[PDB]
Amino acid sequence: HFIDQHRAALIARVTNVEWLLDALYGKVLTDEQYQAVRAEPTNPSKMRKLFSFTPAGNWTCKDLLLQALRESQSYLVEDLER
Amino acid sequence: HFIDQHRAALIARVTNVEWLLDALYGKVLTDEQYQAVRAEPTNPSKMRKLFSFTPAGNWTCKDLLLQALRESQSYLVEDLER
Amino acid sequence: HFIDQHRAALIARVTNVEWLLDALYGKVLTDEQYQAVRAEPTNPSKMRKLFSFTPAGNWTCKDLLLQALRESQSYLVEDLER
Amino acid sequence: HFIDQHRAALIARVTNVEWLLDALYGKVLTDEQYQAVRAEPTNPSKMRKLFSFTPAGNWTCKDLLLQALRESQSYLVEDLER
Amino acid sequence: ADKVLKEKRKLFIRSMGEWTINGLLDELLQTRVLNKEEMEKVKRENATVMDKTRALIDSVIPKGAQACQICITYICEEDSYLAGT
Amino acid sequence: ADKVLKEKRKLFIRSMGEWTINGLLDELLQTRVLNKEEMEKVKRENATVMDKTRALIDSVIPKGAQACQICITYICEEDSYLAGT
Amino acid sequence: ADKVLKEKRKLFIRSMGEWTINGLLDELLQTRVLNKEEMEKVKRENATVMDKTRALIDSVIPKGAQACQICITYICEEDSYLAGT
Amino acid sequence: ADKVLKEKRKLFIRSMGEWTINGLLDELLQTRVLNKEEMEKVKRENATVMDKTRALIDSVIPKGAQACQICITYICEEDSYLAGT
């Protein structure tokens, strides 16, 4: 549920979407999703399309995203726990 | 035609839509259609708009398209024959 | 009447809809109309929505559009006079 | 009102969108808006997106933009006086 | 009078490359063929000598009465092995 | 075998460098798999070495990936760090 | 403190050089803020100093309290005409 | 006068040299018609052989119509073999 709370945060914060995008390729994001999200001009808008492409309540996809965040920058997880 | 059979592959596969677009210009479609196809962000969506302009009953244009496919990427066509 | 005589041609001939838009913004086009015209991807369709906003008897806007066309390309303006 | 009058010039006259960007980022542009404007290809298109963020009724944002123009390029500003 | 010279030589310009490409488009700027903004728009596109060429080719919609041709004369001042064919 | 090559991973192919990527694109051009355009598109548009590599990964040539044993064999020619060589 | 740092800091990061930038990247990488790839992306950004700075500042966007602080403290050991107090 | 000065001598200023270019941008910063930023980008990022010119040609869009006189007078400091100088 942490994720949903930073579903809002990260859409306005993270700037490394293209790398996280990897963590979901085929796992959760097919090429139709992938290209669409990549085509967006801003990192905020890239995340906006991305999170509308993961409407699954499945914890797996959320957990994969978190692991991606942990392996990408490793900072936002503490910064959003506050 | 195989192309009619395998168009679902084509929309998701052929990553040089712009080259194909060149051949279909003066010979097949009106340039308004050129710009239209070029506009949408993804290669899958670019092909989707392309096939919506291309009449399935127009066999002649389809032949030129096949030759274009053969000259464009030249490996996918043989993998589609297989 | 210059416009009503060439509307079909120039809808599909001039590329720089956005440049033409600048003059219109100053005189006639409100910001809502500006954004509307800009939101069309393809230049022929972008002009089509522009001329759909200005198909009335207002001669000032029509007249300023001619001068804009003269200052836009200076090539198509002579080519359509011929 | 001076800037609103001459935006048709300025959209296609001043080049250094990035300098202008700094002041607006502080006052009006949020980070998502900053990225949006930056993603646009041409200085004219960059300014076009900038003025779409700028509220027409706001003197403050207009005034900040003018000061930015003066501190980036006041020699365009002197050519505007002329 | 010049449209066909490219209507039938379109894809040919998909082989035209090099800094001859910039040069090809900065003559059209001097004349009223391309605006500063359109010149900027073509330059801000990021293909190597490919979409560039298709952008100038998008500027042939104008009856190239003296435009389409001004391109052709610049092509003539270069070794146009495509024209030579 | 081909299907596994088509998936494998990206993060592992993402953990590469220059002096392999350059040689990969050279061969992919010369093996006629991608034309000049894709070579230009990868080398010009996709600046970020990673972005470049994700672009070659978009040259997985979807169900054209019998050519991707040209890629795998080039990986075999050099130091393979991937478990799925 | 934290929010104040960044708006005032785009404000003053326009007064700088490359000695500074080069060193900045080394510490921001080693303080685990971002990967080698983003450091590579900023270094291979098609600008000189200026847009690269706006890029580092796009790394302070997700930044938390300590993420701004590591940058500002690195600024501290030099002449901070940036007015870093 | 100012409008004419840009109108032409562009292909002609495109056949200029680093000697003049190097001196020119230094003085354009000094005369403050040119900002620190753009000159800083153009000298490295743009092509050396040619784009060097297109850089000051990015002043042609009124970054100083009075600067057209400043440019021509700087040209007068050396061999103004171009017409209108």
Author numbering:
A (entry chain C), B (entry chain B), C (entry chain A), D (entry chain D): 113 to 194
E (entry chain H), F (entry chain G), G (entry chain F), H (entry chain E): 2 to 86
Q: Would you copy out the relevant sentences from the publication that reported this structure?
A:
NLRP1 and CARD8, two related inflammasome sensors, are highly expressed in a number of cell types and play important roles in both host defense and human diseases. NLRP1 and CARD8 mediate inflammasome formation through their CARD-containing C-terminal fragment (CT) generated upon functional degradation of their respective N-terminal fragment (NT) by the proteasome. In general, inflammasomes leverage supramolecular filamentous structures to nucleate the polymerization of caspase-1, which in turn increases the local concentration of its caspase domain to facilitate dimerization and activation. Here, we determined the cryo-electron microscopy (cryo-EM) structures of NLRP1-CT and CARD8-CT filaments and analysed their assembly and specificity.
Specifically, we designed the type IIa W169G mutant of ASCCARD and the type IIb G20K mutant of caspase-1CARD and connected them in one polypeptide chain using a 5× GSS linker. As expected, these mutations did not impair the formation of an ASCCARD–caspase-1CARD oligomer, and multi-angle light scattering (MALS) measurement revealed a main peak of molecular mass of 86.3 kDa, corresponding to a tetramer of the ASCCARD–caspase-1CARD fusion protein, or an octamer of CARDs with 4 ASCCARD molecules and 4 caspase-1CARD molecules. In this assembly, there is one type I interaction and three type III interactions within ASC subunits and within caspase-1 subunits, and there are three type I interactions, four type II interactions, and one type III interaction between ASC and caspase-1, which must have represented the optimal mode of interaction between ASC and caspase-1. In all three types of interactions between ASC and caspase-1, ASC always uses the type b surfaces (Ib, IIb, and IIIb) to interact with the type a surfaces (Ia, IIa, and IIIa) of caspase-1. Extensive type I and II interfaces dominate the ASCCARD−caspase-1CARD assembly, with calculated buried surface areas of ~450, 600, and 220 Å2 per partner for type I, II, and III interfaces, respectively. Detailed inspection of these interfaces revealed several clear interactions between ASCCARD and caspase-1CARD.
